[PDB]
């Protein structure tokens, strides 16, 4: 089989594409790296940051915790990159985030959480959606973690973060990705026959 190349898409103007001539301040994302030989407590903070990035805060349940992946990471058997791949390919992630979304929206969510940037255009979502259809969600995550964009920004040992959310002269940056892209959209909300209206006012 000839490998079908990724469909070409146009790039958009984003803060992450320009050089930032910035002095470190309180709005800079805290970098969690394994390179500094982390203490036993620093490993727990790095693991916590990786779960927050990939699952969101509301999905940090005791039942979603990948204890075997955490022990492999703490023993140095796997890299932080491989841990992120293991989280994004985990059963609780696929059940909660893959099965409740279309391939297009799942691609957008993975780009935001793993590459730490927004999608350039709707054509990038279409280009990644065919990778998900052909290789499954696992092969899509592996292709995203093997991108030069991932390696150049995070390497093997850094937990992904939202790149350049705030400009140094602004008290208000871009919306956090966890608020911008919640677990599911309006389309899956209508299927669940959920919230919206569930009360009959009063009798009179």
């Amino acid at each position: 089989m000839v490998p079908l190349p990724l469909l070409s898409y146009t790039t958009t103007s984003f803060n992450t594409r320009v050089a930032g001539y910035e002095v470190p301040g309180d709005e800079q994302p805290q970098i969690y790296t394994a390179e500094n030989m982390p203490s036993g407590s620093e490993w727990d903070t790095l693991i916590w940051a990786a779960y927050r990035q990939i699952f969101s805060e509301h999905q940090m349940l005791k039942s979603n915790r990948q204890t075997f992946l955490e022990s492999q990471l703490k023993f140095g058997q796997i890299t932080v990159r491989d841990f992120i791949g293991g989280l994004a390919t985990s059963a609780p992630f696929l059940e909660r985030n893959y099965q409740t979304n279309s391939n297009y929206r799942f691609a957008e969510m993975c780009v935001q959480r793993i590459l730490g940037r927004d999608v350039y255009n709707e054509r990038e979502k279409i280009a990644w959606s065919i990778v998900i259809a052909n290789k499954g969600p696992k092969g899509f995550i592996e292709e995203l973690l093997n991108s030069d964009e991932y390696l150049d920004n995070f390497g093997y040992d850094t937990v992904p973060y939202q790149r350049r959310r705030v400009l140094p002269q602004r008290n208000v940056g871009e919306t956090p990705f966890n608020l911008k892209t919640p677990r599911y959209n309006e389309y899956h909300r209508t299927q669940l026959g959920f919230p919206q209206v569930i009360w009959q006012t009063s009798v009179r």
């Binding site: 002095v23 470190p24 301040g25 309180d26 805060e57």
Partner: protein, 162 residues
């Protein structure tokens, strides 16, 4: 904006936890700092105009070529002197802003983050600003711990320059 309370909130937020006694230790320390630092910032506000003119004259004294050669980067003409002393007052105002804020955040966001490429593009030597900051840190006339941390901020600007 690296100020102590902001970075304490950033630590507690990135950890995902509530505030602990660590941030309250940071706070009683920050209030201890501000209790002299605000009055020292007011004193620098009082002496600001004479300090700016003295720094500009010391810079013209140590580098006399800038007053002589024709060039729009040099302060040979009058508009060079207006813009020049304007950025002297800029440096002094950022020093007072960091004295009020309690951290190097305001100078790091308003001065430092692009100063290298600006001096590269505009043919401005940073040693001029180093001489001016040295004259300011010599002639500010404060005393005690306020004077030491004022010199700390000015030395931080010097190390960020060169």
């Amino acid at each position: 904006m690296k100020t102590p309370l902001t970075e304490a909130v950033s630590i507690a937020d990135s950890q995902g936890r509530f505030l602990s006694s660590t941030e309250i230790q940071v706070a009683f320390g920050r209030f201890r700092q501000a209790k002299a630092g605000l009055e020292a910032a007011k004193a620098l506000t009082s002496k600001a105009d004479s300090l700016i003119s003295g720094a500009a004259q010391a810079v013209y004294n140590k580098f006399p070529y800038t007053t002589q050669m024709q060039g729009p980067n040099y302060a040979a003409d009058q508009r060079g002197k207006d813009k020049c002393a304007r950025d002297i007052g800029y440096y002094l105002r950022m020093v007072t802003y960091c004295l009020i804020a309690g951290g190097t955040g305001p100078m790091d966001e308003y001065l430092i983050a692009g100063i290298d490429e600006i001096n590269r593009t505009f043919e401005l030597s940073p040693s001029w600003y180093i001489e001016a900051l040295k004259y300011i840190k010599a002639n500010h006339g404060l005393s005690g711990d306020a004077a030491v941390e004022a010199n700390s901020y000015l030395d931080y600007a010097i190390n960020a320059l060169s």
